[PDB]
């Protein structure tokens, strides 16, 4: 029932499905690059080029600042149990933190910026995307488990399926790739005409959504067959998310809006109010 949007205007905004602006989270000193909700939906985390993650409540109160990366933070995620936060950074690391802001681990191994991060559904694997053209899988002790190789250019985003067996990656090489947890390449999804900027799984695991600089969202089945292309944004699409009931898709764009869509490609709502590019979007667990 609540949508969060991240923006180059240095804020997060919270909205309802009817299009009302509920709250603006103000306090980062540079662009906000991604956003996530805790599993209980009551805490929001934001990632920023000001090199921090910030934690907020729905009244807009700043609750905590996570300081420790040496360059921009590019993405943030909560573990399924809510106890651990993961952050991705241009400083080439992922950091793991507890909810009070203390650093637990630094995951070292990528050779270029880390662009996104995700947890497996069982909470036991972390996946990271990088400009070094790989996804890496790690445990919560920081040990490297696998390196997923095969993209020809930067990897911009990564997602787990709800059943924790399949990984999806998005890339500047204009494809999404699907993988197993052993690092094997299963499928390449081709069809976008420019960089793919983000990827997500539907909650039933049957559908993949991709966002692209080609101004569209595309929806795909598990065999990599293109189902549907969502057209309407007027500038690059920078991220995509599914609602928990899987009946709504949200897209973020450099055209400064979020758009909400249903499963048949109809446009439901356009959320207007950010003064710069929208860089990411998330749904609360309800």
Numbering used by the authors: 1 to 286
Task: Give excerpts from the publication.
β-Propeller proteins are common natural disc-like pseudo-symmetric proteins that contain multiple repeats (‘blades’) each consisting of a 4-stranded anti-parallel β-sheet. In the larger propellers a so-called “Velcro closure” is found, in which the N- and C-terminal β-strands are part of the same β-sheet, keeping the propeller closed. This “Velcro” can occur in different positions; in the “Velcro 1-3” variant, the closing β-sheet consists of one N-terminal and three C-terminal strands, while for the “Velcro 3-1” variant, the opposite is true. Starting from a highly repetitive β-propeller sequence, we designed a consensus motif sequence that formed a perfectly symmetric 7-bladed β-propeller.
While the space group and packing differ between the crystals, the structure is identical for each protein. The crystal structures also show that the proteins are highly internally symmetric with a backbone RMSD between individual repeats below 0.3 Å. Analysing the thermal and chemical stability of the WRAP-T permutants revealed that nvWRAP-T, lacking the velcro closure, is just as stable as the variant v13WRAP-T. While v31WRAP-T is considerably more resistant to GdnHCl induced denaturation compared to the other proteins, its increased thermal stability is not that significant. Just as with WRAP-T, the inside “Velcro3-1” position is highly resistant to chemical denaturation. In both cases the “Velcro 3-1” position yields the protein with the highest stability, especially against chemical denaturants such as GdnHCl. However, these two examples alone may not be sufficient to determine a clear correlation, and additional proteins will be needed to confirm whether the inner “Velcro” is consistently the most stable conformation for propeller proteins.
